[PDB]
């Protein structure tokens, strides 16, 4: 009936915007991380540590969004 049509679209919008956000945020952050690694090799491990420190914060809201889109898809519809 009318439900699944719109619910699938809602999950679709949710996870599409999540994919845009996480991909672009990590692209910028990784680009700066790679320029820093090219600038100063032998610091790759420390910069990678910091890169993960930030990447963990970047993907939070996108991952709540992914989780709730999957919830809607396979729990509600």
């Amino acid at each position: 009936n009318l439900n699944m049509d719109l619910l699938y679209m809602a999950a679709a919008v949710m996870m599409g915007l999540a994919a845009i956000g996480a991909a672009i945020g990590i692209g910028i952050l990784g680009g700066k991380f790679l320029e820093g690694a090219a600038r100063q090799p032998d610091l790759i491990p420390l910069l990678r540590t910091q890169f993960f420190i930030v990447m963990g914060l970047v993907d939070a809201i996108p991952m709540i969004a992914v989780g709730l889109g999957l919830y809607v898809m396979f729990a509600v519809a």
Partner: protein
């Protein structure tokens, strides 16, 4: 350092000819100062020209 660049002045390219900058006095009565130096230079330039590499001054 931790970083490096590849400027020509830092790499030991093949020696095909050599140049010298020579410092000498403008006034005599210095004793053997100039001739000792010029004899040393001439010996090293002899060595270099033996290997067929030119020299420049």
């Amino acid at each position: 350092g931790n970083l490096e660049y590849k400027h020509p002045y830092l790499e030991d390219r093949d020696v095909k000819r050599v140049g010298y900058l020579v410092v000498s006095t403008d006034r005599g009565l210095a004793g053997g100062l100039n001739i000792n130096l010029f004899k040393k230079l001439l010996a090293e330039m002899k060595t270099w020209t033996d290997k067929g590499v030119q020299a420049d001054l």
